[PDB]
Amino acid sequence: MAFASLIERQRIRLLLALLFGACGTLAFSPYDVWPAAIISLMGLQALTFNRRPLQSAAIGFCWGFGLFGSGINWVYVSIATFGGMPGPVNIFLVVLLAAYLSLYTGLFAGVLSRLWPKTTWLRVAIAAPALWQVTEFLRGWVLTGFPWLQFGYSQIDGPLKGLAPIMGVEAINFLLMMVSGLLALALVKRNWRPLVVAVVLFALPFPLRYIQWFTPQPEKTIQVSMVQGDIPQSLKWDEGQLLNTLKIYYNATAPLMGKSSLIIWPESAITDLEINQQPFLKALDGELRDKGSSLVTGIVDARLNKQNRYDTYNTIITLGKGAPYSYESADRYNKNHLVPFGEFVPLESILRPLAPFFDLPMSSFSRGPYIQPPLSANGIELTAAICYEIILGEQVRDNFRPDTDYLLTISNDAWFGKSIGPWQHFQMARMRALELARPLLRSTNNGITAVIGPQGEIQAMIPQFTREVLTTNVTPTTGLTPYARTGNWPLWVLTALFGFAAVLMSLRQ
Numbered sequence: 001m002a003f004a005s006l007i008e009r010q011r012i013r014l015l016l017a018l019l020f021g022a023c024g025t026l027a028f029s030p031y032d033v034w035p036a037a038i039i040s041l042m043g044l045q046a047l048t049f050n051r052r053p054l055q056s057a058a059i060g061f062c063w064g065f066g067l068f069g070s071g072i073n074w075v076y077v078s079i080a081t082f083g084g085m086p087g088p089v090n091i092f093l094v095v096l097l098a099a100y101l102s103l104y105t106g107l108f109a110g111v112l113s114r115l116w117p118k119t120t121w122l123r124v125a126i127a128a129p130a131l132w133q134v135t136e137f138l139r140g141w142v143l144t145g146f147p148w149l150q151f152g153y154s155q156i157d158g159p160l161k162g163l164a165p166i167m168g169v170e171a172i173n174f175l176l177m178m179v180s181g182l183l184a185l186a187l188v189k190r191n192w193r194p195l196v197v198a199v200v201l202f203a204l205p206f207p208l209r210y211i212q213w214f215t216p217q218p219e220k221t222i223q224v225s226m227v228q229g230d231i232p233q234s235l236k237w238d239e240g241q242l243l244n245t246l247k248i249y250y251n252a253t254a255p256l257m258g259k260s261s262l263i264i265w266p267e268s269a270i271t272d273l274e275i276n277q278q279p280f281l282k283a284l285d286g287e288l289r290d291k292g293s294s295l296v297t298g299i300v301d302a303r304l305n306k307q308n309r310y311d312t313y314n315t316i317i318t319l320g321k322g323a324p325y326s327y328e329s330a331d332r333y334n335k336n337h338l339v340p341f342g343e344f345v346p347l348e349s350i351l352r353p354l355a356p357f358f359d360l361p362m363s364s365f366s367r368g369p370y371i372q373p374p375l376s377a378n379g380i381e382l383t384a385a386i387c388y389e390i391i392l393g394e395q396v397r398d399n400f401r402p403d404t405d406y407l408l409t410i411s412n413d414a415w416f417g418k419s420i421g422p423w424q425h426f427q428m429a430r431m432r433a434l435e436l437a438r439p440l441l442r443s444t445n446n447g448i449t450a451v452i453g454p455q456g457e458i459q460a461m462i463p464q465f466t467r468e469v470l471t472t473n474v475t476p477t478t479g480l481t482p483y484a485r486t487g488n489w490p491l492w493v494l495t496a497l498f499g500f501a502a503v504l505m506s507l508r509q
């Protein structure tokens with residue numbers, strides 16, 4: 001009829017795809033409508049049916065663009081307040097970045113139509129997840145890639161959460177793409193066949209959330225303090241800011257010495273080269289050890305290399321009891337994955353001059369090793385990720401050890417203001433504690449500071465944009481989750497036989 005004829009128009013499909021792409025942003029924090037992920041995915045899968053391959057790529061691009069345009073546009077805040085560029089280019093960069101991520105969604109759309117053009121059950125439950133896995137993997141890897149807004153993260157409190165400990169968050173990406181597809185097939189074909197699968201598949205891993213892969217150790221229960229310094233970003237790296245920042249963090253810590261055994265300061269909390277603060281660090285360490293407490297804090301460290309040059313690192317150092325401070329101490333962590341433009345400039349010979357966005361304070365850094373040992377503090381192992389690194393689930397898992405007591409992440413999210421970015425970031429961190437079944441301590445400058453439980457639950461948190469310290473009791477856990485023993489080669493073999501089956505079929509006809 002006419003309604004169908006309207007739906008059939010391409011321009012109508014492009015507009016619908018925008019709304020369905022943007023709808024997905026609603027799935028992540030702070031909104032947390034986990035069904036919005038299924039709605040948004042259904043739109044992407046259904047809206048591409050019955051189209052030429054290049055036609056479908058354009059729909060997918062718009063769906064990605066709707067999702068990335070609505071979901072990661074908060075980047076604009078950090079570009080506007082500190083980027084020092086005119087209005088139009090600022091939004092041009094934000095749209096450019098969204099367009100770049102949209103190519104990966106669009107590419108998914110386009111190859112799916114070419115090889116599986118018939119709207120079949122094979123196309124949407126067997127080719128799409130595997131191809132999504134590949135394209136989404138590619139988005140996260142290319143050019144030191146950005147894997148933001150994966151729908152599996154929206155399932156942290158939803159029914160599929162019992163699945164991450166076994167196979168990781170990308171398995172939830174895989175199933176969500178698959179179950180959302182059978183629903184799309186049911187509608188368009190008005191067939192109850194995909195519907196009866198989609199709900200069993202969806203509900204089958206609901207009992208998984210009840211498996212407790214870990215055993216808690218209340219003997220080792222400790223009082224932990226995390227201090228939210230709330231240093232404004234505009235002043236953080238100002239040289240006149242240092243004394244005040246040191247006073248803020250020191251004054252907050254000294255009364256907790258002897259009460260909290262672990263005290264944590266956030267990323268690059270000490271805004272000075274480690275070698276320039278030896279008297280402070282040494283006296284602080286002595287004071288801590290006398291009271292029985294240990295301190296873990298971020299700091300910048302320029303260190304001489306084999307070729308007589310200096311690599312500056314974004315680093316965590318430990319001090320105090322059972323973690324004595326020394327510049328020669330090995331009890332430290334150097335950030336490995338660096339945020340583009342924020343910590344390094346891609347073409348400095350040409351890009352550093354252009355604008356104060358391409359020259360930001362402390363934006364030349366070197367990378368630490370991909371694998372580093374735990375921070376040891378008074379007998380507690382700490383597996384550490386700095387700021388952004390916590391969203392890289394495979395990397396955290398590879399640094400994870402069986403004797404790890406807590407996951408640790410310290411971050412400065414003051415760039416993004418009061419946007420939804422810090423919440424998306426905070427939500428993804430929660431997935432790591434669920435995947436590995438250990439509590440997570442998150443210390444931030446003004447961003448979401450919290451303790452996350454072994455099942456991904458929130459144990460305690462403090463409000464944003466305030467200068468206070470979170471002190472609570474936290475208890476470590478032991479045992480290894482399936483995902484902790486494997487990484488995600490198994491989802492990849494599933495991706496592999498699924499992908500193989502599909503290519504053979506699209507090769508039969």
Ligand SMILES: CCCCCCCC/C=C\CCCCCCCC(=O)O[C@H](COC(=O)CCCCCCCCCCCCCCC)COP(=O)(O)OCCN
Binds near residue numbers: 417
């Ligand atoms: C049926 C028809 C439906 C049509 C399709 C719907 C498409 C959906 C459209 C949009 C999706 C949402 C996009 C939000 C837009 C970005 C947010 C925004 O409006 O701006 C910002 C406002 O955004 C907000 O909503 C404020 C956020 C308040 C934070 C407090 C919320 C608490 C969240 C709790 C999270 C739950 C805990 C779990 C987390 C692990 C303004 O902030 P700014 O820093 O002053 O400057 C912003 C400049 N960019």
Ligand SMILES: CCCCCCCC/C=C\CCCCCCCC(=O)O[C@H](COC(=O)CCCCCCCCCCCCCCC)COP(=O)(O)OCCN
Binds near residue numbers: 111134137489
């Ligand atoms: C032509 C489209 C075919 C659609 C279906 C084909 C899907 C099958 C393709 C590749 C199967 C991958 C083979 C399994 C390898 C398992 C080994 C393994 O676990 O290594 C993993 C990492 O290494 C990899 O898996 C690499 C993934 C290979 C991607 C395939 C490259 C495709 C190149 C362009 C594809 C464009 C689509 C087709 C073009 C016509 C484990 O680490 P991680 O979890 O990825 O960490 C994340 C790092 N950012």
Ligand SMILES: CCCCCCCCCCCCO[C@@H]1O[C@H](CO)[C@@H](O[C@H]2O[C@H](CO)[C@@H](O)[C@H](O)[C@H]2O)[C@H](O)[C@H]1O
Binds near residue numbers: 104141142143144
């Ligand atoms: C229609 C779809 C179009 C797709 C979009 C087009 C973008 C084209 C650019 C492709 C260039 C690829 O260049 C890309 O560079 C970076 C390094 O700089 C590589 O990645 C490098 O950093 C990553 C970060 O994890 C390391 O883990 C990796 O081992 C390393 O080699 C990418 O793996 C490489 O492939």
Ligand SMILES: *C(=S)NCCCCCCCCCCCCC
Binds near residue numbers: 143146
């Ligand atoms: C701690 S700093 N949190 C990090 C978030 C800022 C990310 C914005 C990075 C822009 C990605 C550019 C890379 C585009 C893919 C190559």
Ligand SMILES: [Cl-]
Binds near residue numbers: 120
């Ligand atoms: Cl069919």
Ligand SMILES: [Cl-]
Binds near residue numbers: 289320321322323
């Ligand atoms: Cl000691």
